[PDB]
Amino acid sequence: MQATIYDLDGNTDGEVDLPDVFETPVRSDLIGKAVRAAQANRKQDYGSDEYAGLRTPAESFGSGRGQAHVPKLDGRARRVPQAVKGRSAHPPKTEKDRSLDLNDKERQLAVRSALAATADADLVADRGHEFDRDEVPVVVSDDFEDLVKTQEVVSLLEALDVHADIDRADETKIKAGQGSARGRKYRRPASILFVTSDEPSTAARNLAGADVATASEVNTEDLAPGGAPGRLTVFTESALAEVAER
């Protein structure tokens, strides 16, 4: 198919062929698998102290004093799992493999599929993104890679009727639960992904909910945050080109 290229003003400026990958049948099950793996693979090993609750010579008096056969020291029960201060029977363990494998072919296929889900206005709208447009992904001239001010990228996006999505992501959520105590107090919607060719858009990255990536390594999470396909994206003339051989 064909994709309309836009200049830094929001006016059409030609158009190239939308590479074949964007015709890869959307495969949410595969995309979800790839994202679940990426998320699990960055999780850190953890586990309680191997010796917690065991640092004691507590013994059971056995029968005779009308007490349960529970190990005790200085009159207090210890060590056993049913005892306060006792060991944790089956605790989290460092040794556990918290990683997930994924065949390269299966992962690459999901990348292509997530890419394809990008060129579908309906999917993108379903995923939740707010925008007034028909053609998608939003393709732009390589001069985008030279912008420097975030404000500039704003105007361009407003000129593309795609800034509404950033308005959507301009609201952090204060999560329910103790994540808060571990530094995970806030969370916010995912907005526009900006794929360029040379380097990530320093100018757009701070946009609320935005994520910046490069065609050579843009991944499944990038294209389908949370495993949900159809992210409102904006490629770069050259970006669109590179992506094709992924």
Partner 1 sequence: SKQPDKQRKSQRRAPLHERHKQVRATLSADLREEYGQRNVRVNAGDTVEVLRGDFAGEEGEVINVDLDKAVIHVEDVTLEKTDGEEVPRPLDTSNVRVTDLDLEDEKREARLESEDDSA
Partner 2 sequence: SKTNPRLSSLIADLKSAARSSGGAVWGDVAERLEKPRRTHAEVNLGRIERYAQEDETVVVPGKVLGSGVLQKDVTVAAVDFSGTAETKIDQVGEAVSLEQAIENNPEGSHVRVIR
Partner RNA sequence: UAUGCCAGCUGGUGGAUUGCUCGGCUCAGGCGCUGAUGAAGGACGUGCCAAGCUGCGAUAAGCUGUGGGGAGCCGCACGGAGGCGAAGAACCACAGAUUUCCGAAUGAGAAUCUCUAACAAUUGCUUCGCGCAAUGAGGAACCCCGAGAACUGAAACAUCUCAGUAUCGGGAGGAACAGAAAACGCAACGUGAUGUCGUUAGUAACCGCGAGUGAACGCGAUACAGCCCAAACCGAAGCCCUCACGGGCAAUGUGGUGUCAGGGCUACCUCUCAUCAGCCGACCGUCUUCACGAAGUCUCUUGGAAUAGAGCGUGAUACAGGGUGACAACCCCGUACUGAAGACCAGUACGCUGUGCGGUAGUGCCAGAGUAGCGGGGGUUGGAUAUCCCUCGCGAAUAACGCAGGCAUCGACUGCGAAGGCUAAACACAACCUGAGACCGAUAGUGAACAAGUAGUGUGAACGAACGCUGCAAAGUACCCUCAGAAGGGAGGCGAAAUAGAGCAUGAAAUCAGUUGGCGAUCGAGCGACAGGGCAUACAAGGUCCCUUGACGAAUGA
Partner RNA sequence: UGUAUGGCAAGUCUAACCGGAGUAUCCGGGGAGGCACAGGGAAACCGACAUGGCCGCAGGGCUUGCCCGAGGGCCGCCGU
182 touches partner 1 by CB under 8 A = yes
Q: Where are the beta strands (DSSP E) in 18-99?
A: 72-73, 76-77
CA dihedral 79, 80, 81, 87 (to 10 degrees): 20
221 touches RNA by CB under 7 A = yes
104 touches partner 2 by CB under 8 A = no
Size of the site for RNA (CB under 7 A): 81
Site for RNA in 61-100 (CB under 7 A): 73-74, 76, 78, 84-86, 88, 91-92, 94, 98
Query: Judged by CB, which is closer to partner 2: 38, or 109?
Result: 109
175 touches Na ion by CB under 5 A = no
Binding mask 213-242 for partner 1 (x = CB under 8 A): ------------------------------
Q: Under a CB-based contact definition with an 8 Å cutoff, are residues 235 and 195 in contact?
A: yes
Of 15-23, 128-136, 205-213, 234-242: span binding RNA (CB under 7 A):
205-213
Q: Under a CB-based contact definition with an 8 Å cutoff, are residues 210 and 194 in contact?
A: yes
SS3 13: strand
Q: Is the dihedral of CA 134, 198, 215, 217 positive or negative?
A: negative
Among 150, 155, 238, 241, binds RNA (CB under 7 A): 150
187 touches partner 1 by CB under 8 A = no
Query: Could you give the CA distance from residue 195 to residue 90 in angstroms, rounded to a whole number?
Result: 46
